[PDB]
């Protein structure tokens, strides 16, 4: 789309929109992130506050596979399984769904949200938040620890 | 000055010429707006090549019509004459330049029986 470019509409305007006094020189402020702490310091401090310096210790080789764990919050367990099965677990008070969250692909169960009152539900996960446990037990369910 | 024939008033004649085109051969007369800095014409010094403006625009009721008080329509064969059958008194027909003498006679006779005037009727004969 080179015919939509703004330069085309400055075709006979001498300065090409880049100014008559200041001109368009090449790197008049330095290259890349050159002037940080010196003459681009205001830009750096105004838009990237904590840029300079270092904090914390070093993790030499990380291996993110070790600590990878996705989280599902407590208000999505009932939405994990289909609607007619929600209905069928709802009207019947003698059965509860057992959801292996790990199989859907989450490792930890977090506690944000609201479970349905007096609706037991059993959840299997590798990790649980304490509030997630409290809510699951409060609705009459149980948290099963799995690996 | 303004030219007024009938209801058609042409607000200006003698089309604008490019500044300095008179005394430079590389500068064609076709109008270009001069950017300059100290440019005379751009600053609108009196007595030097006034620039076109929107204020010269002809009125839209009589904008595109020819001195015969109708709009021109350029045709390339007899097939493009059909729409003129309805507005034969609002449109005149001009035959395109690259139409042969084969087809020019046909277009002329068809426009004649269609009762629509032809601008360049006596071309190529």
């Amino acid at each position: 789309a080179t015919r939509f470019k703004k330069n085309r509409k400055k075709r006979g305007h001498v300065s090409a929109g880049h100014g008559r006094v200041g001109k368009h020189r090449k790197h008049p402020g330095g290259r890349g992130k050159a002037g940080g702490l010196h003459h681009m310091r205001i830009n750096f401090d105004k838009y990237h506050p904590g840029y300079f310096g270092k904090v914390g210790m070093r993790h030499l080789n990380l291996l993110k596979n070790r600590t990878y764990c996705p989280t599902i919050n407590v208000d999505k367990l009932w939405g994990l399984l289909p609607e007619e099965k929600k209905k069928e677990f709802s009207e019947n008070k003698d059965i509860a769904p057992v959801i292996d969250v790990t199989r859907k692909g989450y490792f930890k169960v977090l506690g944000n949200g609201k479970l349905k009152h007096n609706q037991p539900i059993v959840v299997k996960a590798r990790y649980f938040s304490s509030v997630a446990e409290k809510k699951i037990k409060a609705v009459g369910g149980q948290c099963i620890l799995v690996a | 000055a303004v030219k007024k024939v009938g209801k058609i008033i042409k607000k200006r004649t003698k089309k604008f010429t490019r500044f300095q085109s008179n005394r430079f051969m590389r500068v064609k007369p076709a109008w270009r707006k001069p950017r300059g800095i100290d440019c005379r014409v751009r600053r609108r010094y009196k007595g030097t090549n006034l620039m076109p403006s929107i204020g010269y625009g002809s009125n839209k009721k009589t904008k595109f019509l020819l001195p015969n008080n109708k709009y021109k329509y350029v045709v390339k064969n007899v097939k493009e004459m059909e729409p003129l059958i309805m507005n034969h008194t609002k449109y005149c027909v001009q035959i395109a330049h690259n139409v042969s003498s084969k087809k020019r006679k046909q277009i002329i006779e068809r426009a004649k029986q269609m009762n629509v005037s032809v601008i360049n009727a006596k071309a190529r004969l």
């Binding site: 890349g32 992130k33 830009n43 838009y47 990237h48 840029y51 | -």
Partner: protein, 53 residues
Amino acid sequence: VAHNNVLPNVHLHKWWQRHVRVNFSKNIKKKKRRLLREKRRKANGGTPIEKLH
């Protein structure tokens, strides 16, 4: 740099035009590989070319 942008990070400070390469032949290679394995399984006379893993 100017305005509120992410700090630039482009790792193009070396001679990168030498190393640029574009895969104009992705589907051509796909067809060639499919033809080669089809010819292999046609040549080995009905024995599947896959091996059990």
